[PDB]
Amino acid sequence: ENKITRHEAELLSKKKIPRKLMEEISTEEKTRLLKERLDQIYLVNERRCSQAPVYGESPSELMLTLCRCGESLQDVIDRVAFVIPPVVAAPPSLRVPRPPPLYSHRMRILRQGLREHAAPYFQQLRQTTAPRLLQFPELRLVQFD
């Protein structure tokens, strides 16, 4: 059913907002290897919507306290946050017999892609969405003990 790699006047990858590639397009199988690809990318040259973009302040006074009697932005957070979920569950894992190596390859490629991209901020992200699992009431208990 063909690849349909041609078409896709969507990627805008070869940004080239000028159609100047039109000039080159106008200008054994070498002749075919040239002309066929020249047309194949000329049909892409119509993708000119990237540049000539016409782009274009910073009060950022401060994140004011939420009425916490002076100090704020951490003491309230670490004083109030105590909730623990009753239950924690692992993601479901599908059980299949010997699976195709092609799906394995694609999913593994995705597994590669996710890191590096996330690596620089993977750590920063990992500090978050790690819901607390337990607490430890301090010797403030000694009050009633």
Q: Considering only residues 89 through 108, tell me which ones interact with other proteins, judged by CB under 8 A.
A: 89-92, 101
User: Within 10 Å of residue 44's Cβ, how many Cβ atoms?
Assistant: 20
Among candidate residues 17, 12, 37, the one with its CA nearest the CA of residue 25: 37
Structure tokens at 53: 């973009």
Q: Please select the residue that binds other proteins; options are 22, 45, 88, 97, rule is CB under 8 A.
A: 88
Of 93 and 96, which CB lies nearer to other proteins in the complex structure? 93
Among candidate residues 49, 24, 43, 44, the one with its CA nearest the CA of residue 34: 24
How far does the chain reach from its first CA to its final CA, in angstroms?
78
Instruction: Give min distance, CB of 127 to other proteins, in A.
Output: 10
Q: Please select the residue that binds other proteins; options are 66, 94, 96, 142, rule is CB under 8 A.
A: 66
Of 56 and 97, which CB lies nearer to other proteins in the complex structure? 56
Would you say 18 and 49 are in contact if contact means Cβ atoms under 8 Å apart? no
Q: How many residues bind other proteins (CB under 8 A)?
A: 83
Of 3 and 95, which CB lies nearer to other proteins in the complex structure? 3
Dist. CA 44–CA 27, nearest whole Å = 17
Instruction: Give min distance, CB of 31 to other proteins, in A.
Output: 8
The reply on whether position 125 binds other proteins by CB under 8 A is yes
The reply on whether position 57 binds other proteins by CB under 8 A is yes
Which residues within the stretch 22-41 sit at the binding site for other proteins (CB under 8 A)? 24, 27, 29-30, 33-34, 37-39, 41
Dist. CA 18–CA 139, nearest whole Å = 71
Of 71 and 94, which CB lies nearer to other proteins in the complex structure? 71
Among candidate residues 6, 14, 81, the one with its CA nearest the CA of residue 43: 6
